[PDB]
């Protein structure tokens, strides 16, 4: 039965994401904040995609890094072909959805990956942060406040539901995000921001002693 | 079955990895030390990859030599395309992980291999030696002190756990590595170093009478 085989793939993909560590992304006063539980120092789950578009993922590394690379490729080819301000988080999210659907139906094994594409406004501009979550099948969801990916998402999502506050500063949003993530030191956290105040490249990692001071 | 493949392929390749000689790599004062149990004089399990990046492997010779060659190819194409100091042990390890994952899922038989990529700092520079272990599936692990590959890894890994000392000289690290490997003369040992003191090319074999003096 095709429907039973599809349930076999849906189930397969859900279990792999559960094996992966958790990631959260939430809106705060200066933009968007990515906080992931990541022990390695070389392997990363948060990345710049374009000037104002960031990316977080949770699942099999050799696949969401494949998607990371494809997305970078796409964004730069568009930006050069048209212009930088034409590439938007919405296009990127849509491409990931088409690609994960095609993979989910056509390839042997479905990517066990969960994606979050984030976008902030340009410099000196005003607009609310946009978060999109793309799941393994191709489904895409528009999130107003925060996205939680990988592992057991219920307790983290609820803790964030109680603690979230719009226009929280960088330090408060970091405390809320680490707290809800616990439901970890600088040696087990990957933290980055989409700082809306930067002139062009908004993505910026917060590591080491600066991260130490913030948390 | 999707479950059958992952569980059966895993067993077929872990068997073939335990079905082979043992190699150790450990950090010492002058860089990194590779000590392998190798009877042949033509077939080698330790190799230079790039200026400061070395490579050891355990499993099926034709396959980890295929990986050896691929890695050399990669490193030189990068070094020429960009520059020599841009190729890092981290990139190499990552490529081996992607390739062993793709092989493990797409080819008929999984590569019964276990890899260790080692890197030291450049000349007159200061930085800790980095050891990465890549397993047959694509998994990659960051090791601070030593890697043990192939055969029965438990007794060797424990003996090294008791004997290891950071900043041990070349002779002491050789004694520790041979001792823990026994848990063999110059006619059954392949010994090389990533000497951090060399100006450019750090890899250097220790064979014959010089090896005789060291051990």
């Amino acid at each position: 039965s095709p429907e039973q085989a599809m349930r076999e793939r849906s189930e397969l993909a859900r279990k792999g994401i559960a094996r992966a560590k958790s990631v959260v992304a939430l809106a705060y006063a200066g933009g968007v904040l990515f906080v992931a539980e990541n022990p390695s120092r070389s392997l990363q789950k948060i990345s710049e995609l374009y000037d104002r578009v960031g990316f977080a993922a949770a699942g099999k590394f050799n696949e969401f890094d494949n998607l990371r690379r494809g997305g970078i490729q796409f964004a730069d080819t568009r930006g050069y072909a048209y212009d930088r301000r034409d590439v938007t988080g919405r296009q990127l999210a849509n491409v990931y959805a088409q690609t994960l659907g095609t993979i989910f139906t056509e390839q042997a094994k479905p990517y066990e990956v969960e994606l979050c594409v984030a976008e902030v406004a340009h410099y000196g501009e005003t607009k609310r942060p946009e978060l999109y979550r793309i799941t393994y099948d191709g489904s895409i969801a528009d999130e107003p406040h925060f996205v939680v990916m990988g592992g057991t998402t219920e307790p983290i999502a609820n803790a964030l539901k109680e603690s979230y506050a719009e226009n929280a500063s960088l330090t408060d949003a970091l405390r809320i995000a680490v707290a809800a993530l616990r439901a970890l030191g600088v040696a087990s956290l990957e933290v980055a921001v989409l700082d809306a105040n930067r002139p062009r490249r908004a993505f910026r990692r917060i590591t080491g002693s600066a991260l130490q001071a913030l948390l | 079955s999707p479950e059958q493949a992952m569980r059966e392929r895993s067993e077929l390749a872990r068997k073939g990895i335990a079905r082979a000689k043992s190699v150790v790599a450990l950090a010492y004062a002058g860089g990194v030390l590779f000590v392998a149990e190798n009877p042949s004089r033509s077939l080698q399990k330790i190799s230079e990859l790039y200026d400061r990046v070395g490579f050891a492997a355990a499993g099926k010779f034709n396959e980890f030599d295929n990986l050896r060659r691929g890695g050399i190819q990669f490193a030189d194409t990068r070094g020429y395309a960009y520059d020599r100091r841009d190729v890092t042990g981290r990139q190499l390890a990552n490529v081996y992980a992607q390739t062993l994952g793709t092989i493990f899922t797409e080819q008929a038989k999984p590569y019964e291999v276990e890899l260790c990529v080692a890197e030291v700092a450049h000349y007159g520079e200061t930085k800790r030696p980095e050891l990465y272990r890549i397993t047959y599936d694509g998994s990659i692990a960051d090791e601070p002190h030593f890697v043990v590959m192939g055969g029965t890894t438990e007794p060797i890994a424990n003996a090294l756990k008791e004997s290891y000392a950071e900043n041990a000289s070349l002779t002491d690290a050789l004694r520790i590595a041979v001792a823990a490997l026994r848990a063999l003369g110059v006619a059954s040992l392949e010994v090389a170093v990533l000497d951090a003191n060399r100006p450019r090319r750090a890899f250097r074999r220790i064979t014959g009478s010089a090896l005789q003096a060291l051990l």
């Binding site: 992966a20 560590k21 099999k60 050799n62 | 994952g101 990659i140």
Partner: peptide, 5 residues
């Protein structure tokens, strides 16, 4: 393949 981040 136990490589999940």
């Amino acid at each position: 393949l136990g490589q999940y981040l």
